[PDB]
């Protein structure tokens, strides 16, 4: 061979075959990242619409958030722009969610009762590969009750085959979380910060 080409069969680790396994059984898969517990499942599957109302259970008119590798992975998936993609291309990836417009997608079960769709670019290396090709559902597991589990063995125990746990686990801090609604030119970068008491750069070494 002369030119540097690509192989045929791609290596599939243990975690890779484990994720596609539960997906075959039509179940929900969770995955925490730099922020808190996240959710990932076959978005183009009816199983996602069902497990969606279970977590939220508010109004079927609100759009849903999905997961992908990058803007290049979701071309004809969403509606992007020039300077718009530039703003996000500046500080990406990260534990922030990217909400954009919606393409000519017919399924209103994912697009919601509006013409907008959410996206999320986490630091999950594995989820980055799968989401790159086939898109997945990305929802934050932190609704009413105790959605985020503290023990990996606790999830597999309760949800025998419902909410399949993860082999990778979390990534960074359990909190907080950033939410950006990058629609068009005007970006809605809105991080969930604290009250008016940001750490100044004054002189203070006596923390005691």
């Amino acid at each position: 061979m002369l030119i540097r080409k690509i192989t045929r069969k791609n290596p599939s680790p243990d975690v890779l075959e484990e994720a596609i396994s539960v997906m075959e059984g039509g179940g929900i898969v969770i995955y925490p990242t730099d922020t808190i517990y996240g959710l990932g499942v076959n978005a183009l599957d009816e199983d996602a619409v069902r497990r969606l109302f279970r977590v939220k259970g508010r109004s079927p008119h609100k759009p849903v958030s999905i997961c992908v590798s990058c803007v290049d992975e979701i071309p004809r998936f969403s509606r992007p722009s020039g300077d718009a993609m530039e703003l996000m291309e500046r500080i990406l990836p990260g534990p922030y969610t990217v909400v954009l417009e919606r393409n000519e997608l017919i399924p209103d079960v994912i697009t919601g009762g509006s013409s907008r769709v959410g996206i999320r670019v986490p630091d999950d290396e594995i989820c980055r590969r799968i989401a790159a090709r086939f898109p997945v559902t990305a929802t934050s597991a932190n609704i009413s009750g105790k959605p985020p589990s503290p023990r990996l063995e606790e999830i597999v125990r309760d949800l025998d085959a419902v909410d399949l746990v993860l082999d990778a686990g979390d990534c960074l801090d359990m909190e907080p979380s950033t939410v950006i609604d990058l629609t068009v030119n005007p970006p809605r970068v809105l991080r969930r910060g604290k009250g008016p008491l940001d750490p100044v750069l004054l002189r203070g070494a006596g923390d005691v």
Side-chain angles (χ1 to χ4, degrees):
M1 58 250 207
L2 312 158
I3 191 93
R4 305 145 250 217
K5 61 178 102 128
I6 191 145
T7 59
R8 244 277 225 242
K9 260 180 101 66
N10 198 239
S12 322
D14 240 291
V15 194
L16 252 302
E17 66 156 291
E18 106 182 32
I20 46 89
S21 209
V22 54
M23 285 203 161
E24 180 185 296
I28 166 60
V29 227
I30 20 122
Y31 247 110
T33 341
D34 321 304
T35 45
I36 346 168
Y37 250 73
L39 283 131
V41 73
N42 236 115
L44 272 298
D45 263 77
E46 242 121 61
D47 324 316
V49 186
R50 205 143 231 219
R51 305 259 149 218
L52 168 276
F53 207 66
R54 296 273 252 234
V55 167
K56 256 228 217 215
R58 264 120 92 101
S59 11
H61 306 326
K62 290 214 132 270
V64 317
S65 192
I66 66 123
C67 171
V68 86
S69 131
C70 257
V71 190
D72 204 78
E73 295 313 282
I74 36 116
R76 59 225 98 236
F77 290 62
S78 37
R79 162 172 213 257
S81 208
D83 210 47
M85 290 323 100
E86 298 226 83
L87 192 276
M88 195 45 200
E89 269 178 53
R90 279 151 173 250
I91 24 156
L92 81 320
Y96 351 104
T97 194
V98 261
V99 193
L100 272 139
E101 259 262 326
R102 92 120 124 107
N103 234 40
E104 227 253 292
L105 246 158
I106 288 89
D108 283 339
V109 286
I110 6 159
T111 63
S114 270
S115 303
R116 275 165 71 164
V117 178
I119 315 172
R120 205 208 181 96
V121 196
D123 258 314
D124 264 346
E125 205 216 278
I126 309 299
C127 240
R128 243 186 70 159
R129 249 88 225 205
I130 306 300
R133 293 175 84 217
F134 258 74
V136 237
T137 298
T139 146
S140 316
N142 262 279
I143 51 113
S144 235
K146 193 189 108 191
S149 231
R151 2 184 126 199
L152 231 121
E153 228 259 300
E154 185 179 80
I155 314 174
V156 278
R157 216 289 302 184
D158 216 274
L159 299 315
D160 241 274
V162 198
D163 227 313
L164 237 296
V165 84
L166 33 288
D167 222 274
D170 66 298
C171 222
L172 238 297
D173 220 52
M174 195 225 92
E175 65 104 90
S177 95
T178 309
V179 180
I180 304 165
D181 268 69
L182 170 60
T183 8
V184 200
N185 347 283
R188 271 249 199 265
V189 45
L190 232 114
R191 53 150 186 79
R192 268 223 213 116
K194 232 208 142 132
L197 32 129
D198 69 300
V200 289
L201 268 298
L202 227 84
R203 41 198 239 128
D207 226 302
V208 182

